[PDB]
Enzyme design. Structure first.
Site, PDB file in Angstrom:
ATOM      1  N   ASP A  83      95.413  57.551 -28.374  1.00 58.01           N
ATOM      2  CA  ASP A  83      94.355  58.384 -27.785  1.00 58.01           C
ATOM      3  C   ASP A  83      94.781  58.794 -26.366  1.00 58.01           C
ATOM      4  OD1 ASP A  83      92.034  59.672 -26.652  1.00 58.01           O
ATOM      5  OD2 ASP A  83      90.736  58.198 -27.521  1.00 58.01           O
ATOM      6  N   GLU A  94      94.300  62.084 -23.790  1.00 54.69           N
ATOM      7  CA  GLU A  94      93.524  63.293 -23.591  1.00 54.69           C
ATOM      8  C   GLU A  94      93.573  63.813 -22.165  1.00 54.69           C
ATOM      9  OE1 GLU A  94      89.363  62.849 -25.036  1.00 54.69           O
ATOM     10  OE2 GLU A  94      90.065  61.063 -26.095  1.00 54.69           O
ATOM     11  N   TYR A 108      95.166  61.240 -31.498  1.00 58.45           N
ATOM     12  CA  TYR A 108      93.745  61.579 -31.631  1.00 58.45           C
ATOM     13  C   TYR A 108      93.458  63.024 -31.236  1.00 58.45           C
ATOM     14  CZ  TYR A 108      88.865  61.937 -30.302  1.00 58.45           C
ATOM     15  OH  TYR A 108      87.574  62.392 -30.236  1.00 58.45           O
ATOM     16  N   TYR A 112      83.067  65.776 -34.282  1.00 61.05           N
ATOM     17  CA  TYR A 112      81.803  65.285 -33.753  1.00 61.05           C
ATOM     18  C   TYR A 112      80.722  66.353 -33.725  1.00 61.05           C
ATOM     19  CZ  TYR A 112      84.765  61.377 -32.111  1.00 61.05           C
ATOM     20  OH  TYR A 112      85.657  60.326 -32.022  1.00 61.05           O
TER      21      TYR A 112
END
Length: 324
Positions: free
Chosen positions: A102, A104, A175, A218
């Site tokens: 992950d 970002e 991710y 999401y």
């Protein structure tokens, strides 16, 4: 096959006696042995190694971790710290599970660093101005962009290869890639932004060396029913598009799925949204999906019991009847 993975940090509830054994026992969701957060089925690594990133202090200042932008970073320092994190969080060398990195801080495509990621463009440009006061605007900008995109690539490709070399049986992926930006300020409708797809085609170095693609799907409450499904549909179709173009091996599409509305975090997904959205992932041909959760939503005994109630009354049953 279709496999659902549990990536909710329910290990935090175990000291109140809730061990969530029904995740795999009743609903068939793949779950690390003894409900550990990291184990043989899946392990997520949040911000591993020392990726160059721009951080803002409470004091107001901008802290540049390992350079700020990737052209100013030290790869070998990043790579050695990444090694320590990997060894400690995934101690077993034969880990055969899903390995999720992950990261970002920034996107590897210079253009995609918009809105809150704009400081990465600004500082990239600024450094070049410092070195070359007489260069014209167009020239400075072009050079900033080539340095960011070269070293951006380098940081991302070399960390994926190091993870692959040290844990060669694991299925590795970043991710949230590939991005799509549907229903976002940059692309209002449910189709991915057209330039991003072309940019996804240009990122074959990433998608060819990964094993699993993990678009984040999401949901938001301030969307109609059909757009929540279009939201998911768009992102997963982009992932499937890339995957069937890959050449080194079969790629898996495992969308990251959250049970809260991202714009209304104290509300769990309705039964109607769970069914329509999990039906969409299934109909499109994805290989499964990964259920995620935040620490802040189950960090008390009361939050754990309520989550467990939601799990057994809605989420679990929805996953078992639509997906498994």
């Amino acid at each position: 096959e279709f496999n659902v993975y549990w990536n909710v940090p329910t290990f935090m509830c175990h000291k109140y006696g809730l061990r969530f054994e029904e995740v795999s026992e009743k609903y068939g969701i793949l779950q690390n042995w003894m409900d550990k957060f990291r184990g043989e089925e899946i392990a997520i690594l949040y911000d591993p190694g020392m990726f160059p990133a721009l951080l803002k202090d409470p004091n107001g200042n901008v802290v540049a971790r390992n350079g700020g932008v990737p052209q100013l970073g030290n790869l070998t320092k990043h790579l050695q710290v990444f090694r320590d994190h990997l060894i400690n969080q995934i101690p077993d060398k034969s880990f055969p599970g899903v390995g999720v990195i992950d990261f970002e801080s920034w996107r590897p495509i210079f253009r995609q660093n918009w809105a809150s990621l704009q400081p990465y463009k600004k500082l990239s440009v600024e450094v070049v101005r410092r070195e070359h006061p007489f260069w014209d605007d167009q020239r400075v900008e072009q050079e900033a962009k080539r340095r960011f995109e070269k070293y951006g690539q380098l940081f991302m490709e070399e960390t994926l290869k190091a993870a692959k070399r040290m844990r060669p049986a694991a299925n590795w992926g970043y991710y949230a890639y590939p991005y799509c930006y549907n229903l976002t300020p940059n692309q209002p409708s449910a189709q991915c932004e057209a330039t991003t797809m072309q940019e996804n085609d240009k990122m074959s170095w990433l998608f060819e060396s990964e094993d699993v693609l993990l678009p984040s799907v999401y949901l938001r409450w301030n969307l109609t029913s059909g757009e929540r499904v279009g939201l998911v549909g768009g992102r997963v179709k982009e992932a499937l598009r890339i995957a069937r173009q890959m050449t080194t091996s079969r790629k898996k599409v495992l969308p990251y799925y959250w049970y809260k509305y991202q714009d209304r975090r104290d509300t769990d997904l309705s039964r109607a949204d769970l069914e329509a959205t999990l039906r969409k992932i299934t109909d499109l041909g994805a290989d499964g999906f990964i259920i995620w959760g935040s620490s802040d939503d189950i960090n008390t005994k009361a939050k754990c019991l309520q989550f467990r109630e939601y799990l057994n009354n809605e989420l679990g049953p929805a996953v078992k009847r639509i997906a498994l």
